[PDB]
Nucleic acid binder design. Structure first.
Ligand SMILES: Nc1ncnc2c1ncn2[C@@H]1O[C@H](COP(=O)(O)CP(=O)(O)OP(=O)(O)O)[C@@H](O)[C@H]1O
Length: 342
RNA sequence: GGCCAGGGGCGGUUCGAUUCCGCCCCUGGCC
C-alpha cells in the first residue's frame, strides 16, 4: 500500500537493485529494498503504522526496517554512499554493477515501470558483470569478490573492461588494503553459494585468494580434489537427502587443507565457522590419514567403529575423496539401511 | 539477517541417552 502513502505525502519511492535483479531473473525474494526521493523514515513509519507493525528507524542513517508477514522491507533515503536532495539516479549510480543498478517504480503515477539508465537490463540479458565506471574497483575492492560471486552464481562473465580493471585492482594490491571484515564476510557469502566451486574457479583465474589468505597458493591436487567433492556432494544430496549440511565449508576445508599459518585455524576463526567445521578441521590431521589407512583392513563390523566419526557427517564425505575406500562407505549408508529395516 | 553461545521447543538417529543432528524461542556477545 506504499504507492498510496507515497502519493498522500507527495513522494516517489522505488524498489532497488538487488531485489530487482532477482525479479527479472524470476526469483522470489523476501528481502526488499526501497529508495525514497524524500524521507524514508516517515514512509516506513506510516507504513507499519497502517499495518500495526513495529518499526526500527535509524536516524542519521536515513533508514528504517519493518516486517509484514515474511516480508522484510528496508526503506532508505536517496544518497551518495555515506547532503541536499539527491535524485534516484544519483543513488543508483553509486551501485555495484549494471544488473544491480536498476529500480522499479512503486509510484501509482507510473507503477510497475522498470528504471534503468546504465543498461542493466541488457547486461542482464547478455549475461554480463559490468561496473558503472573505471574507479569502481578502486572505490571498493570488495566488489572484486562480488563481481566473481555473481559471475559465478549467475554463470555470467565479466565485460572486457571490467575484467581488465578487476585484474588491475588485484595486482594493485587493494585486496590487501580493504577492511578485512568486508572481504571476510563477502567470502562467507560466496561460501554459502550452491555454485560456490565455480566461483572458486574464478578466484583461481584472478589469483584473489593468494592475497586474502596469507599462506595460500593454488595446487592442482586440491583443485581436482574440489571437483571430486563436487561429485560426492551432488549424489549424497540426492540419496542421503534426509540429512544434509552446509557443503560449502567442506570445500573451504580442502582449500585450507595443506594448512598454512600454524594449522591456519586462525582463518576458520575469522570465518564465523560452525562447530562441525572448526571441529572436522582438527580431525583432518589426526585421522584423515589413520582412518583411511587403518580402514584398509576391514571385512565388515569395523564399519561400526568408524560410524562413530559420522557424529558430524562431513568426514564421512571427505573419505570418498580417496577412490580406494569410496564404494566401502557407499555401501555403509545402504548397509545400515538394512539394520533399521531388518 | 551468519555464527559464539547462555537457557526452551516442536520433530528425530539409535535402545535409550538433556552427549547426535532440523529448526524455532529466549539471554548476552562478533560480521
Ligand atoms: N559495495 C557495494 N557496492 C555496490 N552495491 C552494494 C555494495 N554492497 C551492497 N550493495 C547493494 O546492496 C544489496 C545487497 O543486498 P542483498 O539482499 O544481499 C542482495 P544482493 O547482494 O544484491 O543479491 P543476493 O540475493 O544474491 O544476496 C545489493 O542490492 C547491492 O546493489
Amino acid at each position: 500500500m506504499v504507492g498510496q502513502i507515497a502519493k498522500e505525502m507527495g513522494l516517489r519511492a522505488y524498489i532497488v537493485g538487488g531485489v530487482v535483479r532477482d525479479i527479472l531473473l524470476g526469483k522470489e525474494v523476501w528481502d526488499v529494498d526501497f529508495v525514497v526521493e524524500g524521507n524514508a523514515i516517515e514512509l516506513a513509519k506510516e507504513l507499519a503504522r497502517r499495518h500495526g507493525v513495529n518499526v526500527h528507524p535509524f536516524p542519521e542513517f536515513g533508514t528504517a526496517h519493518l516486517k509484514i508477514g515474511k516480508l522484510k522491507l528496508e526503506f532508505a533515503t536517496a544518497r551518495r554512499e555515506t547532503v541536499e536532495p539527491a535524485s534516484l539516479k544519483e543513488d543508483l549510480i553509486r551501485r555495484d554493477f549494471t544488473i544491480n543498478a536498476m529500480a522499479i517504480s512503486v509510484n501509482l503515477e507510473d507503477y510497475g515501470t522498470l528504471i534503468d539508465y546504465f543498461g542493466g537490463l541488457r547486461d542482464l540479458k547478455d549475461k554480463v558483470i559490468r561496473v558503472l565506471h573505471p574507479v569502481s574497483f578502486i572505490e571498493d575492492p570488495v566488489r572484486i569478490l562480488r563481481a566473481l560471486r555473481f559471475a559465478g552464481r549467475l554463470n555470467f562473465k565479466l565485460s572486457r573492461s571490467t575484467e581488465k580493471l578487476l585484474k588491475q585492482a588485484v595486482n594493485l594490491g587493494l585486496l590487501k588494503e580493504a577492511p578485512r571484515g568486508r572481504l571476510i564476510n563477502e567470502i562467507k557469502l560466496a561460501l554459502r553459494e550452491d555454485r560456490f566451486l565455480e566461483i572458486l574457479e574464478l578466484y583461481r583465474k584472478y589469483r584473489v585468494l593468494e592475497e586474502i589468505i596469507e599462506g595460500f597458493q593454488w595446487n592442482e591436487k586440491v583443485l581436482q580434489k574440489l571437483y571430486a567433492l563436487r561429485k560426492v556432494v551432488d549424489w549424497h544430496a540426492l540419496e542421503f537427502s534426509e540429512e544434509r549440511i552446509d557443503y560449502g565449508w567442506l570445500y573451504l576445508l580442502i582449500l585450507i587443507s595443506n594448512l598454512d599459518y600454524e594449522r591456519g585455524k586462525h582463518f576458520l576463526e575469522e570465518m564465523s565457522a560452525p562447530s562441525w567445521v572448526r571441529e572436522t578441521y582438527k580431525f583432518m590431521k589426526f585421522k584423515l590419514g589413520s582412518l583411511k589407512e587403518e580402514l584398509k583392513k576391514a571385512k565388515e563390523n569395523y564399519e561400526v567403529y568408524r560410524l562413530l566419526k559420522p557424529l558430524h557427517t562431513s568426514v564421512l564425505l571427505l573419505l570418498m575423496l580417496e577412490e580406494e575406500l569410496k564404494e566401502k562407505i557407499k555401501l555403509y549408508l545402504e548397509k545400515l539401511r538394512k539394520v533399521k529395516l531388518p
